[PDB]
Amino acid sequence: KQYIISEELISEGKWVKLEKTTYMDPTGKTRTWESVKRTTRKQTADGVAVIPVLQRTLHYECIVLVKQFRPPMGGYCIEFPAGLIDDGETPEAAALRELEEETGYKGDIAECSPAVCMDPGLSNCTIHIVTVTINGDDAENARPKPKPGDGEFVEVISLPKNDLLQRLDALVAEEHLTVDARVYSYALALKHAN
Amino acid sequence: KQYIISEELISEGKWVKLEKTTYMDPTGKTRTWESVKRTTRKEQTADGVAVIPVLQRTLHYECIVLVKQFRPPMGGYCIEFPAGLIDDGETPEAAALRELEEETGYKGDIAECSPAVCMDPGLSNCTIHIVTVTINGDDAENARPKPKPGDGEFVEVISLPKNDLLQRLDALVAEEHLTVDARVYSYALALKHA
Ligand SMILES: CCCc1nnc(NC(=O)c2ccccn2)s1
Ligand SMILES: [Cl-]
Ligand SMILES: [Mg+2]
Ligand SMILES: [Mg+2]
Ligand SMILES: [Mg+2]
Ligand SMILES: [Mg+2]
Prior knowledge:
The structure is a homodimer.
Chain A: E1 3-12, E2 16-24, E3 30-38, E4 47-55, E5 62-70, E6 75-79, E7 82-84, H1 91-103, E8 108-112, E9 116-117, E10 126-135, E11 155-160, H2 164-175, E12 178-179, H3 181-192
Parallel strand pairs in A: 4-10, 6-12
Antiparallel strand pairs in A: 1-2, 2-3, 4-5, 4-7, 5-6, 5-11, 8-10, 9-10
The structure holds N-(5-propyl-1,3,4-thiadiazol-2-yl)pyridine-2-carboxamide, chloride ion and magnesium ion (4 copies).
PDB class: hydrolase
Assembly: dimeric
Entry title: PanDDA analysis group deposition of models with modelled events (e.g. bound ligands) -- Crystal Structure of NUDT5 in complex with Z52425517
């Protein structure tokens, strides 16, 4: 019943473009929307985000997160490890790779989502969310070695799964970091579960 | 260490702008980013809200109330938490309750309100409050409720049991060609992981 009729390019950068979408609303009226797209997508999705469950015996399970400066935010943010899927990469493979580059941890795939939207009122951006467990007791994850690219500066922050929400709320109150909405949503459901 | 040096407008639509962001990396080098921003953000603590609406009813499993809408930037239908931008001077909590009633017909009760969290911080500055609201489904106010969609809003309400959310979302994606929101999916994953 609703559909896209055309897309007019407004402005194209190296990484991002702005478009004006014309679409048919369900009353049979023609309408417009300003839409953002990345210029990098081919793939299943633009990117992956990794939910990395650090499992170590006799310890609480941790969720491994990363803190970085985000120029669009003008501030530091706390996020799941994430990045863009290389052309010819699978989502699962991008997840292990990104997880290694950003944290040094080497992990195992548990499940992978279908492509899910990031901010669908604004952009077409999508990701796979890939749940990964990290055997924290193996020697490869003893002194994890982050292999970050040129210009990436990432701090690793592992927080306990069973108090995640309170821990994030603290980082926000006390560090003026911004927590990512997917990370916050995850933390909320850990509390809301039964 | 890192901070914004300058923000140079590239292209402004009525709703969205692209900016060339210049910032200082932690080595001391000047770098650039392409950044998206909304034009609508005021003194609001955030662009918007998303509502986690827990429908509670005697002798019923709790449900999460979701909405399905056409999203022009996506070219397709998306399943999301009820959500809208915060009006000038409106509180996040008022906005949440109001968007919830407008989009679903339900009258909720505030449970909790997050700090401002980032929607896609490598791309945009957009932020929301995630507002958890309970809905007393035994109250007559919430018996056979009508959405009051604004101008050009066409929303369908989908209520799924909290205890099976992830499988129910996976089934919808299997039978329907629709996209699930990344927040909704993250929340459904944590409900399983707990
Ligand atoms: C990032 C959001 C981009 C938008 N582009 N177009 C938008 N139109 C409206 O909100 C609207 C205007 C007139 C009648 C009905 N709805 S919002
Ligand atoms: Cl798990
Ligand atoms: Mg990354
Ligand atoms: Mg990378
Ligand atoms: Mg809305
Ligand atoms: Mg609305």
